[PDB]
Design a protein around this nucleic acid. Structure first.
Ligand SMILES: [Zn+2]
Ligand SMILES: [Zn+2]
Ligand SMILES: [Zn+2]
Ligand SMILES: [Zn+2]
Lengths: 199, 202, 201, 201
DNA sequence: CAGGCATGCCT
DNA sequence: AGGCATGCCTG
DNA sequence: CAGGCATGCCTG
DNA sequence: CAGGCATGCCTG
């Protein structure tokens, strides 16, 4: 799949991706704009994402996160960290994650980082865990290692984050995508975006 | 089983598990005060903090109650809550203590209190078996001590924490869970007054 | 050798002098110099001409060394090098005799030697001293700077000084002049802005 | 066991001077020096440049030892160490050469020798003496101070003096200088507050 | 036991 | 830079 | 933390 | 080529 699909597909387990209530602070670690279906967050901060499933998926089921560029002109490029953050010492000493992936998982020994031999795509996968008793959602901790504005990397090009519920073989059970923007001042760039969504 | 992100989502369960606090002194530098307006416990380091356990139905045998701290804010949720290096290797409240110096929470006056060190999650918790309420008391009282201030550099470093109390069986299946914010400070009455006034301006 | 390179001016026996010709006043001029702030403004990879003058010819085997170093003491111990992005880029790198990490290049002189000091790690570029052409007043050296002063992963908005050292075959210092360096995209803009803030309160 | 090293100001033969350069007036500047109080204000683990001037070049093997001691008499018997928090902590302790437990470290010099005096228990960091470079006035040494002055478990608000000693390879003292040290979060505020009060009294 | 300070850290 | 947070002293 | 400056790059 | 912007990062 040179161009992975971003179509919403709830599927047999009704896969839903939601965000908790976040800070309205100008430079909060992360905020979500329901209006824009757009995640804002800062580089290397913990982003908690919320999944929901109606009926649990099969043993060996898992969650996949792949970034993809928004604009049709740039969809064919694999999304990676820019050279500066990849080679730089920040967040790279003693890390299992390959220094090249844009998306990391936090707080999970069982995270596996996939480098597709055919497509070249990079993505991070964790085995599905059912919510703990009393809890409604399962929470995956995501980190994004580059700014959307990084030159040599994303280079101010918006991306979309594809979360995919898969079967151990690879069979997609559900799919959700949202816009992702890594920036320094999320509260600011959200308010600017919405004020200009008046049109 | 092992969980890396302990959920603090309140869950009463089949036994209607409830965690409440008795009346507390409003004195500035009192040993502990509780703000139900904020579900926030203010207590001093290494002082006796009674907790109230209540259930509508007696729980099964081998049931216990576990007490583990977690950082409130997700940015730090992954960090295991422990003591600061100063107090861990200090000379205070560590001489001859059946408790590991590294644990933040301890139990007072219960020789059945064991301290776990989950080697998979590295998390530290304290487990005591479920004793009923004393005849004529309507609730089970559990004495907790917290051996490191919220502000201690090298450990919590001014990071809020939550205290998760969990009602579980001998194997670890959770039956019920209540959480509340914990602040280990020096002038609990002042800092409860400050917080409560702030929430009241909006 | 010396892990913290000196930047103090030293004319020495030959009155080593370092000057800049007249520069354009354009916002996006390739380079401009501010004698008020002793700062140079230049563009990435653009020819920047520096002018060298001495009163009396130095001995044979004399050289000119150009070395950058951070201005603030909290950063001086770090070596000034290209950012990863420019270093690994195809631009100005394949088909070039300069190491892709050196910040300062010499334009138009194949006798220039790029030095990586094995003990101190400092990077520099050295050219043999040449007397001004006949009837000319100064020896001009064409320098190139390969990172913007703000490049993340390299200079990272940290101010540098460029140190021009007159030295002999062995390396003894015959003279030294220095001046603050700033690589950017609009040198006229940033110069007018710093000269305006020089007259503050 | 007991040492109580001298802090008596003693220039000796080579005219040993220890001075400071122009520092910032900002509240949270990294470091600042009030000649009025002979007192150095600085932030924790930040680069503090020390200027050392002499007259005659000392013998070979002559080195420079920075040792901290407490000011008030009731404390001078106590050894100035790092608090257990910063010593056992990870901050500024990963991948370095200095013992986690020292207060004073030298930044940017691999010849520095951290000394654990087996008799006196005193901790000090010794660097060899290198002369100024061609054209410069002083030898600049770069010092880091690992704890705040207010660290409980360590200094604990007690003021300290830092003893800069020029000394021979045998240990013979060729000159000594001293000044108060304060490691705080806002050196400008506290220096401004310190000078103001003294002037008013 | 509350008033209030010095000083780190947030605003 | 201004001011608040917060351990700890003091009376 | 919110305000506004610092800068590379667009735009016409 | 000058005006203006987008966005990382200080400033008070
Ligand atoms: Zn990047
Ligand atoms: Zn502690
Ligand atoms: Zn660069
Ligand atoms: Zn300390």
């Amino acid at each position: 799949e040179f161009i992975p699909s971003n179509t919403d597909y709830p599927g047999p387990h009704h896969f839903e991706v939601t965000f908790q209530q976040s800070s309205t602070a100008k430079s909060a670690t992360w905020t979500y704009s329901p209006l824009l279906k757009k995640l804002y967050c800062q580089i290397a901060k913990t982003c908690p994402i919320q999944i929901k499933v109606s009926t649990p998926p099969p043993p060996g089921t898992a969650i996949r996160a792949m970034p993809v560029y928004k604009k049709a002109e740039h969809v064919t490029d694999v999304v990676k960290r820019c050279p500066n953050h990849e080679l730089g010492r920040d967040f790279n000493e003693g890390q299992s994650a390959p220094a090249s992936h844009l998306i990391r998982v936090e707080g999970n020994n069982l995270s596996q980082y996939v480098d597709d031999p055919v497509t070249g795509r990079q993505s991070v996968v964790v085995p599905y865990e059912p919510p703990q008793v009393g809890t409604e959602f399962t929470t995956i901790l995501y980190n994004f290692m580059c700014n959307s504005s990084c030159v040599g990397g994303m280079n101010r090009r918006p991306i979309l984050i594809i979360i995919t519920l898969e079967m151990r073989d690879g069979q997609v059970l559900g799919r959700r995508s949202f816009e992702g923007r890594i920036c320094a001042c999320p509260g600011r760039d959200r308010k600017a975006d919405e004020d200009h969504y008046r049109e």
